[PDB]
């Protein structure tokens, strides 16, 4: 008769990193990093995103002739841009408060474009048809932004402008206009007659006076003068007012909208799909089951915290050593046949042979391991400098806790062997391979007495030999 002790073995190929060793295979482990992918840009919530192709946000909201006219979905949860989408503001200049505007238009519930100032009626004392340029071509001819009108002098005079609109739509209206900055004084006179001009856009929420600068720029996009683009939000009831004596690109179409909170912009070449998935990334989506992810710093929605790590996997079980292939510390090889628990015995007598796990040591380990794994997930709840240091702090903690895990198993096995060794001092000798050579024959019910933890030896060892 012979009784031996051993650990669990499995066909798992999960590898974890410890303090001393790395790429260590274990029987059971939990990952702390989900970057699993091949997901395709989908749609957060039922609401699909607005896809910008051949244009950016500036060209879309201003209405560059090269962009696709409405169209335009009524509602969108986010906006997707292309890196090769660089034709936006056709006329040179810069968009004032562009980052702010990008975040406003990110998420919207209702969106409607309307003709705030009709070209035919609103401007009787100024020429609106001449407002075209070579910088904004449509069909091999001079054109301009669909949403704006470039007012030019009507003959030999540019009368003082004063137009206003009252927001009766019942929801905040986005108004956009432009201020022209000519190249030379000759062009300034040829466009608005007057020399010392000014522009003023007043409202309850916004007020600013623009004095246009007449100067020769480097001349890019075939235009020597520049044009700055401004915008504001008119609350329902507030009245926008446009007082100006020249150099003003009045608006034609405003946007009545009801914005939504949060969200952002994605700049990627990935296409759109209809799988209705709820987090999103710059390139695809994820299942967000894990509290960490490593795809891109930019994330939309309730996604895991981004962490730039090669791999994070916390170990739960013990080292997997099956050692049985091809032809065939103190103990070598694992118990593939035993699946009852992590630690167990193996009896051998005339009645039969079989494996059995010690549930007192196994259940106490599962309770402590599960408790320790949850204690680590409770630590991640700590919500560029912090990112790199927290990543290293998390890496160090996973490596540290992996060594404490495998040593806790190594100790639990040594305690199980000492439990058997202390019961039968002389009735059985130590083989040295984690087994015990029973001198006296011990039946199945006698083997259970060792498992129960109640063994006596009133019988002689029989070890007389020799």
């Amino acid at each position: 008769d012979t009784l031996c002790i051993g650990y669990h073995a499995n066909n798992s190929t999960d590898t974890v990193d410890t303090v001393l060793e790395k790429n260590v295979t274990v029987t059971h482990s939990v990952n702390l990093l989900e970057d699993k992918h091949n997901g395709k840009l989908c749609k957060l919530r039922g609401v699909a995103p607005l896809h910008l192709g051949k244009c950016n946000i500036a060209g879309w909201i201003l209405g560059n002739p090269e962009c696709e006219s409405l169209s335009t979905a009524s509602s969108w949860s986010y906006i997707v841009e292309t890196p090769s989408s660089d034709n936006g503001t056709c006329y040179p200049g810069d968009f004032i408060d562009y980052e702010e505007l990008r975040e406003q238009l990110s998420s919207v519930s209702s969106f409607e474009r309307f003709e705030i100032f009709p070209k035919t009626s609103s401007w009787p004392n100024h020429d609106s048809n001449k407002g075209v340029t070579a910088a904004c071509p449509h069909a091999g001819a001079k054109s301009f932004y669909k949403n704006l009108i470039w007012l030019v002098k009507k003959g030999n005079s540019y009368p003082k402008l004063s137009k206003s609109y009252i927001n009766d739509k019942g929801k905040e209206v986005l108004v956009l206009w432009g201020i022209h900055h000519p190249s030379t004084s000759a062009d300034q006179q040829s466009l608005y007659q007057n020399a010392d001009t000014y522009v003023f856009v007043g409202s309850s929420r916004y007020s600013k006076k623009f004095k246009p600068e007449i100067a020769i720029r480097p001349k890019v996009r075939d235009q020597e003068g520049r044009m700055n683009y401004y915008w504001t939000l008119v609350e329902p009831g507030d009245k926008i007012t446009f007082e100006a004596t020249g150099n003003l690109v009045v608006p034609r179409y405003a946007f009545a909208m009801e914005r939504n909170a949060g969200s952002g912009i994605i700049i990627s070449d990935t296409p759109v799909h209809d799988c209705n998935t709820t987090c999103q990334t710059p390139k695809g989506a994820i299942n967000t089951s894990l509290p960490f992810q490593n795809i891109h710093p930019i994330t939309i929605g309730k996604c895991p915290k981004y962490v730039k790590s090669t791999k994070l996997r916390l170990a739960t079980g013990l080292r997997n050593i099956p050692s049985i292939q091809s032809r065939g510390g103190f103990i070598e090889g694992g118990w593939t046949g035993m699946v009852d628990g992590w630690y167990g015995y193996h009896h051998q007598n005339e009645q039969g042979s079989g494996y059995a796990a010690d549930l007192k040591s196994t259940q106490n380990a599962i309770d402590e391991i599960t408790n320790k794994v949850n204690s680590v997930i409770e630590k991640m709840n700590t919500q560029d400098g912090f990112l790199d240091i927290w990543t290293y702090n998390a890496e160090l903690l996973v490596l540290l806790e992996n060594e404490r895990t495998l040593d806790y198993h190594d100790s639990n096995v040594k305690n199980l062997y000492e439990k058997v060794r202390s019961q039968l001092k002389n009735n059985a000798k130590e083989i040295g391979n984690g087994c015990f050579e029973f001198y006296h024959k011990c039946d199945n019910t006698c083997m259970e007495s060792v498992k129960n933890g109640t063994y006596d030896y009133p019988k002689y060892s029989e070890e007389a030999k020799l």
Partner: antibody, heavy 119, light 111 residues
Amino acid sequence: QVQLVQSGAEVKKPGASVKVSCKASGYSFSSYGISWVRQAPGQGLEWMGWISAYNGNTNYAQKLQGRVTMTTDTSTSTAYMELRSLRSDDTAVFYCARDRPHILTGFDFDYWGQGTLVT
Amino acid sequence: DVVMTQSPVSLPVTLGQPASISCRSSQGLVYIDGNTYLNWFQQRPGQSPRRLIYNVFTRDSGVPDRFSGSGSGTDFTLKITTVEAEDVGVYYCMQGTHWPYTFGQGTKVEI
């Protein structure tokens, strides 16, 4: 096809014990764990115990640990449950369903019982 | 024991529009490799409960795609797009890994 069946409704006075059976039909009996749960009208649900045909070791509810007892048979493929003392608020509808083979593996109630309504 | 706190205990809804229930625990559930929660159950009046979404997200076999359980760690929900008339009964939360299961108050759906 792998639906399980159990004993019908019963009735016992406060003091006398009661026994309920749960046979595994249609199996597919790889000898994996069986569990028991109660549900009294007006309350909710609470675990009673668990037993396995692979593992002889069982688990009980600390509160009712003393009274409850679990047994099973591999040949007939049937699990038994028994209670000692009875009272008005301990009376509830008892269900039985499969759980798991090993302790280390996951849990699942793929198939459920009928519901032995005992008063 | 894990404290499975349900909310709300009474859930009044109508047809067409979706719904959502919330469950939170005292300790987080993991149980070795993401074994996690067991699921949610739908118990019709005078009938046994059936499986729905085992392992938090994995749906059950023989169950429409209208149901969808989602969550990570403690909390939060099980969403059902478009409520039919047959979707009525009592619902309860999953066991807390550790043997003390401790089920919910099993909130009552009504149309």
